[PDB]
Design a protein around this ligand. Sequence first.
Ligand SMILES: *[C@@H]1O[C@H](CO)[C@@H](O[C@@H]2O[C@H](CO)[C@@H](O)[C@H](O)[C@H]2NC(C)=O)[C@H](O)[C@H]1NC(C)=O
Ligand SMILES: *[C@@H]1O[C@H](CO)[C@@H](O)[C@H](O)[C@H]1NC(C)=O
Ligand SMILES: *[C@@H]1O[C@H](CO)[C@@H](O)[C@H](O)[C@H]1NC(C)=O
Ligand SMILES: [Zn+2]
Lengths: 592, 194
Amino acid sequence: SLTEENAKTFLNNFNQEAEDLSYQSSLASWNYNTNITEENAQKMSEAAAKWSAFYEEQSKTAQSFSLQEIQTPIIKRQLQALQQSGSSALSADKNKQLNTILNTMSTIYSTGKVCNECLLLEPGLDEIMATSTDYNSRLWAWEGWRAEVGKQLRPLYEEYVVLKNEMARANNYNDYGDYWRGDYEAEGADGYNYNRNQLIEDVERTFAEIKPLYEHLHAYVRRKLMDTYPSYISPTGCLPAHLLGDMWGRFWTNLYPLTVPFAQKPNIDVTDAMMNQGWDAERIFQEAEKFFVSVGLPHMTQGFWANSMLTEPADGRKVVCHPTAWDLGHGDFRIKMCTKVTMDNFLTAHHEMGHIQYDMAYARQPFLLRNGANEGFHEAVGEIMSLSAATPKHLKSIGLLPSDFQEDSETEINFLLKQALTIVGTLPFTYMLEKWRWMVFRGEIPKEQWMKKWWEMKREIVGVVEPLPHDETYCDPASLFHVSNDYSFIRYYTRTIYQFQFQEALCQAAKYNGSLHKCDISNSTEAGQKLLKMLSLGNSEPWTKALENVVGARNMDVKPLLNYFQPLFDWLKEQNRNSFVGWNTEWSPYAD
Amino acid sequence: LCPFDEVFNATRFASVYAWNRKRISNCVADYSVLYNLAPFFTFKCYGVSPTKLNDLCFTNVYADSFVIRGDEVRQIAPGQTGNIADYNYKLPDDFTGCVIAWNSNKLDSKVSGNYNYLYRLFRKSNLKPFERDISTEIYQAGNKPCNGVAGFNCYFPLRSYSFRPTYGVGHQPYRVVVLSFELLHAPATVCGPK
Ligand SMILES: *[C@@H]1O[C@H](CO)[C@@H](O[C@@H]2O[C@H](CO)[C@@H](O)[C@H](O)[C@H]2NC(C)=O)[C@H](O)[C@H]1NC(C)=O
Ligand SMILES: *[C@@H]1O[C@H](CO)[C@@H](O)[C@H](O)[C@H]1NC(C)=O
Ligand SMILES: *[C@@H]1O[C@H](CO)[C@@H](O)[C@H](O)[C@H]1NC(C)=O
Ligand SMILES: [Zn+2]
């Protein structure tokens, strides 16, 4: 219990300096993003270098304190987050090679091009993979992108994997996959501990219950593609990867125009009625603030309205035009978005306002603890608000939809099908990719069996088959942005689970008496107080307690997810009764 | 009349760690002019009420002016605890006077940061009521001597306020003015108008 006031004073001084340094760095980054110039770029780089140097110097000293001797929970947590060095564990030459390989792979990815026609990735090729409906048109693109990017990235990934493994081993971790799993690790009492090795068991058990719904969605989509790809779809086989409406099959949203349940009754789009009423940029954020106040959350500060860039500047300034909630610190919250008069823009503004509210929640916690419980709670806190705002009753009350509008059963089915294609479709992909990456880092898949096991998993778990045989020279995983660039991918699965968990938890607090997908938490102070009970904690307490504060449970549970798509589940069960549920893994298009 | 124009309308207020003090001896006072600006989130009176200030007469009044964060203004009160209450400015548990403060973002804030205001971050012990410490020696936190060089377990006590125009709303500068109505078995001089 000795030598604790020293660590307390160290944390106090560290916070005092880091708050100002982070404010400076965030302001520089904001000035750069809102005004792209070489001067702003140099200022941002200098600020980032200063902040990195300060943080690294303070972390090197943080390791001097033996954490096991500290007894105060909050001080122990503050020390634990700062003691983790990470990349600094490697030597000079090891970091040399690691950064070289990483940035070279990033440049090979961004600067990738396919030549039979010649279209870049973001323009042209993605538009093809999204809208194109011809077999060869998509096949040649899907083959060329890989043969051009993954074949060049393969020799670099074989070294990057071992480099990251060496980096993790220096940090007392087993492998790099185990290092990423540390984000969900939790410490506390007996009823709040969460072993790092238990994440795989939860991910597997949670996926075992989603297979039926995903299997039915796959059986339904497969038949609906036979009308457009007759000789390229099998009645009992897997789906071709290039026919998933995406370069990698991550999102099936592009398949909605073809797999629509009912074509004679489309979805809702209040863009026309929104523009006719004179809804400008700020009008949307005003409605978002009103909604967030109806649940009992704080109001928006005048500083936010004054500093935020809620409209594309006509002064010719270059902007990255990407939605992002900014928390510059010291109460300086801002939103950066080229707001337009549309419904997608409305939902994104709601999501960013939810992010800002979340950031405002835990502002009372120490600087080192001003972060979400985990990488899944952040996006979910905004996704739940976006869902609550998409209810037809909410749009009718706001004045966009006429009060005479009566919701129909077919429109709800179409909306749920689109959501599943955009939500349920990516759940198996993320799990498969994360499991493959873990097995690679752990050394369970030798370098001579990367693509073989990758495609076997694609066929078994995801039910996707390749159009042409790929040998060990190809690297399909690296063809994805999140694989080339070092970014954890399991965050999306946990986010998809936690968003539905919170939606089902707050609906009970709001005393709803209807379907979950039509739940509107608006005008329910009890719902916000229960949610704010967790947003204020942030990273102060283990994520288990944060989840218990809202959902009541201490771990992931996919039952709310299945409850959300329960109508779509029964609809698919009634429709997929016209086919064989499942898919075979021994069938392939290249079996000519 | 009393020189209230010098306490509030000063072109530059003192730091919380070096709060200045001014006293009244002879002339008449007037409390109805303490209206620096419309929103006065800080008009807390202790031991007295604002409506009877004119009728009551005191021997002398001490006015302490200093700037602190908006979040720290609540710490200026009898019996409160905090970095400002313990290490910068402590009020007695039974204090009679008036605490006045107002926003000063337009004046004491700059885009590049106004590092002219400072505060004491660490101190070996809490300050006594109405105590003012302006030392600058290093704060020894461990079992090693502070040899005048800052470093691990040897931190500088004073830190700077980086007031900015967009510095939120709680961290913005607030010009505080604490009026202590000292009264004793002495000739009363600070009376109200007649
Ligand atoms: C946007 O970028 C421009 C690039 O020129 C910035 O302009 C310079 O700003 C410095 C400091 O503001 C001035 O001393 C120079 O004279 C400026 N050049 C011009 C063209 O005036 C500009 O400040 C940045 N603007 C915004 C709005 O962030
Ligand atoms: C929310 O509350 C306001 C005020 O009572 C009311 O006008 C509006 O109809 C309510 N809307 C919802 C979503 O129930
Ligand atoms: C400071 O001068 C202004 C006039 O510019 C006056 O209104 C204000 O009351 C003065 N300050 C005080 C509290 O005496
Ligand atoms: Zn985002």
